[PDB]
Every structure is written in structure tokens, then in C-alpha cells.
Motif scaffolding. Sequence first.
Motif, PDB file in Angstrom:
ATOM      1  N   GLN A 188       0.866  -1.104  -0.040  1.00 15.43           N
ATOM      2  CA  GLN A 188       0.047  -0.049  -0.055  1.00 15.43           C
ATOM      3  C   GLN A 188       0.984   1.298  -0.020  1.00 15.43           C
ATOM      4  O   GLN A 188       0.590   2.115  -0.810  1.00 15.43           O
ATOM      5  CB  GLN A 188      -1.026   0.009   1.319  1.00 15.43           C
ATOM      6  N   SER A 189       1.893   1.134   0.783  1.00 18.44           N
ATOM      7  CA  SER A 189       2.722   2.522   0.852  1.00 18.44           C
ATOM      8  C   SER A 189       3.678   2.511  -0.377  1.00 18.44           C
ATOM      9  O   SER A 189       3.943   3.572  -1.137  1.00 18.44           O
ATOM     10  CB  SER A 189       3.713   2.261   2.195  1.00 18.44           C
ATOM     11  OG  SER A 189       3.774   3.734   2.634  1.00 18.44           O
ATOM     12  N   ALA A 190       4.317   1.394  -0.883  1.00 26.51           N
ATOM     13  CA  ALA A 190       4.972   1.445  -2.194  1.00 26.51           C
ATOM     14  C   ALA A 190       4.035   1.801  -3.328  1.00 26.51           C
ATOM     15  O   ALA A 190       4.536   2.751  -4.254  1.00 26.51           O
ATOM     16  CB  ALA A 190       5.703   0.312  -2.281  1.00 26.51           C
ATOM     17  N   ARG A 191       2.965   1.578  -3.224  1.00 28.10           N
ATOM     18  CA  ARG A 191       2.161   1.937  -4.363  1.00 28.10           C
ATOM     19  C   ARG A 191       1.650   3.423  -4.112  1.00 28.10           C
ATOM     20  O   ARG A 191       1.576   4.088  -5.112  1.00 28.10           O
ATOM     21  CB  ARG A 191       0.743   0.940  -4.275  1.00 28.10           C
ATOM     22  CG  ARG A 191      -0.090   1.468  -5.156  1.00 28.10           C
ATOM     23  CD  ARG A 191      -1.580   0.238  -5.151  1.00 28.10           C
ATOM     24  NE  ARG A 191      -1.871   0.484  -3.718  1.00 28.10           N
ATOM     25  CZ  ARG A 191      -2.280  -0.569  -2.638  1.00 28.10           C
ATOM     26  NH1 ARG A 191      -1.870  -1.910  -3.030  1.00 28.10           N
ATOM     27  NH2 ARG A 191      -2.827  -0.197  -1.723  1.00 28.10           N
ATOM     28  N   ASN A 192       1.354   3.613  -2.986  1.00 24.72           N
ATOM     29  CA  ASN A 192       1.164   5.384  -2.666  1.00 24.72           C
ATOM     30  C   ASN A 192       2.461   6.193  -2.923  1.00 24.72           C
ATOM     31  O   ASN A 192       2.056   6.942  -3.545  1.00 24.72           O
ATOM     32  CB  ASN A 192       0.670   5.506  -1.226  1.00 24.72           C
ATOM     33  CG  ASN A 192      -0.497   4.923  -0.766  1.00 24.72           C
ATOM     34  OD1 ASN A 192      -1.472   4.667  -1.694  1.00 24.72           O
ATOM     35  ND2 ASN A 192      -0.658   4.813   0.646  1.00 24.72           N
ATOM     36  N   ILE A 193       3.591   5.647  -2.844  1.00 29.11           N
ATOM     37  CA  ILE A 193       4.749   6.298  -3.467  1.00 29.11           C
ATOM     38  C   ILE A 193       4.845   6.408  -4.772  1.00 29.11           C
ATOM     39  O   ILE A 193       4.964   7.475  -5.378  1.00 29.11           O
ATOM     40  CB  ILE A 193       6.062   5.706  -2.512  1.00 29.11           C
ATOM     41  CG1 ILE A 193       6.004   6.013  -1.177  1.00 29.11           C
ATOM     42  CG2 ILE A 193       7.372   6.276  -3.348  1.00 29.11           C
ATOM     43  CD1 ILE A 193       7.253   5.158  -0.540  1.00 29.11           C
ATOM     44  N   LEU A 194       4.301   5.460  -5.618  1.00 22.23           N
ATOM     45  CA  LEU A 194       4.570   5.476  -6.916  1.00 22.23           C
ATOM     46  C   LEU A 194       3.544   6.412  -7.352  1.00 22.23           C
ATOM     47  O   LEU A 194       3.715   7.290  -8.054  1.00 22.23           O
ATOM     48  CB  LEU A 194       4.097   3.894  -7.340  1.00 22.23           C
ATOM     49  CG  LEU A 194       3.837   3.785  -8.891  1.00 22.23           C
ATOM     50  CD1 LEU A 194       5.052   4.172  -9.706  1.00 22.23           C
ATOM     51  CD2 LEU A 194       3.400   2.529  -9.186  1.00 22.23           C
ATOM     52  N   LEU A 195       2.314   6.343  -6.825  1.00 19.09           N
ATOM     53  CA  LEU A 195       1.212   7.256  -7.309  1.00 19.09           C
ATOM     54  C   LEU A 195       1.568   8.751  -6.870  1.00 19.09           C
ATOM     55  O   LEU A 195       1.216   9.629  -7.689  1.00 19.09           O
ATOM     56  CB  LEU A 195      -0.111   6.775  -6.638  1.00 19.09           C
ATOM     57  CG  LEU A 195      -0.592   5.168  -7.124  1.00 19.09           C
ATOM     58  CD1 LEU A 195      -1.838   4.543  -6.297  1.00 19.09           C
ATOM     59  CD2 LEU A 195      -1.129   5.509  -8.627  1.00 19.09           C
ATOM     60  N   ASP A 196       1.684   8.940  -5.690  1.00 23.40           N
ATOM     61  CA  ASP A 196       1.792  10.399  -5.062  1.00 23.40           C
ATOM     62  C   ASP A 196       3.130  11.008  -5.252  1.00 23.40           C
ATOM     63  O   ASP A 196       3.150  12.087  -5.504  1.00 23.40           O
ATOM     64  CB  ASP A 196       1.624  10.246  -3.474  1.00 23.40           C
ATOM     65  CG  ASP A 196       0.281   9.705  -3.169  1.00 23.40           C
ATOM     66  OD1 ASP A 196      -0.497   9.328  -4.051  1.00 23.40           O
ATOM     67  OD2 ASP A 196      -0.053   9.495  -2.015  1.00 23.40           O
ATOM     68  N   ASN A 197       4.530   9.994  -5.229  1.00 22.36           N
ATOM     69  CA  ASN A 197       5.719  10.830  -5.593  1.00 22.36           C
ATOM     70  C   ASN A 197       5.911  10.469  -7.066  1.00 22.36           C
ATOM     71  O   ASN A 197       6.543  11.641  -7.531  1.00 22.36           O
ATOM     72  CB  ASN A 197       6.790  10.090  -4.730  1.00 22.36           C
ATOM     73  CG  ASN A 197       6.631  10.726  -3.202  1.00 22.36           C
ATOM     74  OD1 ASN A 197       7.278  11.374  -2.729  1.00 22.36           O
ATOM     75  ND2 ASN A 197       5.565   9.930  -2.522  1.00 22.36           N
ATOM     76  N   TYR A 198       5.848   9.296  -7.677  1.00 18.31           N
ATOM     77  CA  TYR A 198       6.348   9.286  -8.968  1.00 18.31           C
ATOM     78  C   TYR A 198       5.320   9.631 -10.161  1.00 18.31           C
ATOM     79  O   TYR A 198       6.007  10.074 -11.296  1.00 18.31           O
ATOM     80  CB  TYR A 198       6.993   7.933  -8.935  1.00 18.31           C
ATOM     81  CG  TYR A 198       8.387   7.476  -8.342  1.00 18.31           C
ATOM     82  CD1 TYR A 198       8.188   7.420  -6.936  1.00 18.31           C
ATOM     83  CD2 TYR A 198       9.435   7.866  -8.981  1.00 18.31           C
ATOM     84  CE1 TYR A 198       9.398   7.319  -6.175  1.00 18.31           C
ATOM     85  CE2 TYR A 198      10.679   7.660  -8.366  1.00 18.31           C
ATOM     86  CZ  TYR A 198      10.562   7.580  -6.998  1.00 18.31           C
ATOM     87  OH  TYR A 198      11.715   7.407  -6.222  1.00 18.31           O
ATOM     88  N   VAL A 199       4.171   9.523 -10.045  1.00 19.56           N
ATOM     89  CA  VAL A 199       3.192   9.953 -11.091  1.00 19.56           C
ATOM     90  C   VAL A 199       3.670  11.259 -11.613  1.00 19.56           C
ATOM     91  O   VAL A 199       3.889  11.676 -12.785  1.00 19.56           O
ATOM     92  CB  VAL A 199       1.935   9.609 -10.890  1.00 19.56           C
ATOM     93  CG1 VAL A 199       0.881  10.399 -12.065  1.00 19.56           C
ATOM     94  CG2 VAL A 199       1.816   8.158 -11.013  1.00 19.56           C
ATOM     95  N   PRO A 200       3.658  12.288 -10.663  1.00 18.99           N
ATOM     96  CA  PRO A 200       4.191  13.652 -11.213  1.00 18.99           C
ATOM     97  C   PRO A 200       5.413  13.911 -11.850  1.00 18.99           C
ATOM     98  O   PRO A 200       5.555  14.476 -12.579  1.00 18.99           O
ATOM     99  CB  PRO A 200       4.214  14.236  -9.668  1.00 18.99           C
ATOM    100  CG  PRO A 200       3.188  13.669  -8.692  1.00 18.99           C
ATOM    101  CD  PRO A 200       3.158  12.245  -9.368  1.00 18.99           C
ATOM    102  N   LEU A 201       6.500  12.887 -11.322  1.00 23.56           N
ATOM    103  CA  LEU A 201       7.738  12.758 -11.867  1.00 23.56           C
ATOM    104  C   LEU A 201       7.596  12.349 -13.351  1.00 23.56           C
ATOM    105  O   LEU A 201       8.193  12.887 -14.296  1.00 23.56           O
ATOM    106  CB  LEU A 201       8.711  12.131 -11.196  1.00 23.56           C
ATOM    107  CG  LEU A 201       9.316  12.934  -9.770  1.00 23.56           C
ATOM    108  CD1 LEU A 201      10.007  11.949  -9.126  1.00 23.56           C
ATOM    109  CD2 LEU A 201      10.017  13.955 -10.190  1.00 23.56           C
ATOM    110  N   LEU A 202       6.864  11.108 -13.512  1.00 25.61           N
ATOM    111  CA  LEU A 202       6.972  10.378 -14.806  1.00 25.61           C
ATOM    112  C   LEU A 202       6.100  11.437 -15.857  1.00 25.61           C
ATOM    113  O   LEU A 202       6.452  11.253 -17.037  1.00 25.61           O
ATOM    114  CB  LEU A 202       6.254   9.087 -14.342  1.00 25.61           C
ATOM    115  CG  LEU A 202       6.840   8.037 -13.697  1.00 25.61           C
ATOM    116  CD1 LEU A 202       6.001   7.062 -13.165  1.00 25.61           C
ATOM    117  CD2 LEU A 202       8.180   7.370 -14.418  1.00 25.61           C
ATOM    118  N   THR A 203       5.317  12.145 -15.445  1.00 27.10           N
ATOM    119  CA  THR A 203       4.624  12.964 -16.533  1.00 27.10           C
ATOM    120  C   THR A 203       5.174  14.509 -16.487  1.00 27.10           C
ATOM    121  O   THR A 203       4.299  15.097 -17.331  1.00 27.10           O
ATOM    122  CB  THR A 203       2.947  12.979 -15.552  1.00 27.10           C
ATOM    123  OG1 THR A 203       2.850  13.439 -14.537  1.00 27.10           O
ATOM    124  CG2 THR A 203       2.355  11.490 -15.498  1.00 27.10           C
TER     125      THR A 203
END
Length: 132
Positions: free
Chosen positions: A89-104
Motif C-alpha cells: 500500500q505504501s510503495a503503491r502510494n509512493i508510486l502514485l503520489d511521488n512518482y506519477v508527477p515525476l513521470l508525467t
Amino acid sequence: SNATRFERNFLINSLMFLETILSVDKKLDDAIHHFTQGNPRYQINSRITNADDWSKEDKLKFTSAIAEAIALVSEKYENPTSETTEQIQSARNILLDNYVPLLTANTDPENRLKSVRENSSQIRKELIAKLK
């Protein structure tokens, strides 16, 4: 440092699947979607950088690929403890909350998903370099 290793490995594998999905044609992307079909609601759309400059189709391609990537990585962990489910849940939350802004971020309008692919490859290479 090892407290973050779960999320770092989750990110690396998720980015690998993201790049793979963004590297094949529409028919294969639809086949991949069908395979992961049935469904979590990750709210990926809201995390896209400069989302008003993204077409609906690009957003759909990206969010589908992220959701499929999370599904594919997450199903590798059979019979998870509460700790593993909370870790996912936390690693997925990091993906979504931290990395989606970076990736996009900083994507080229000519082909935004190609830019996402390349952002992802660089981020994954950096993380892998510091895991090894």
C-alpha cells in the motif's frame, strides 16, 4: 536504508512494466489490460503533471499502464502478511503520489508517452544503480 528497499524494488519493477506497456502496440496494450482486468481505483488522473495539456487518450494510455503495472507487480507476492499488504500500500502510494508527477513532467507534446517511457527508464536505471 533497508526500510525503503521494498518501495524501491516495487518502483523498479513497476517502471519496467510501465515501459514495456508503453513500448508495444495498441492491440498488445489491450491484451495486457484484459489480462489484468478485474478493479482498484488508484486516482492516477489527478496526479498527472500539467494534466490540462494532456489529451484524454494520452491520459487513458498512461493511467491504464500504471494500473496494469501495479497489478502485475503486486500479484508476485502470494499470501501476504498484513505487513506486506501495508508495504504494498505504501510503495503503491509512493508510486502514485511521488512518482506519477515525476513521470508525467516535461513530456514532449509530440509523443508524451514516449517521454514517459524515457523518464521511466532513467529513473529506473538510477534506482537500480543504487540498489546494486
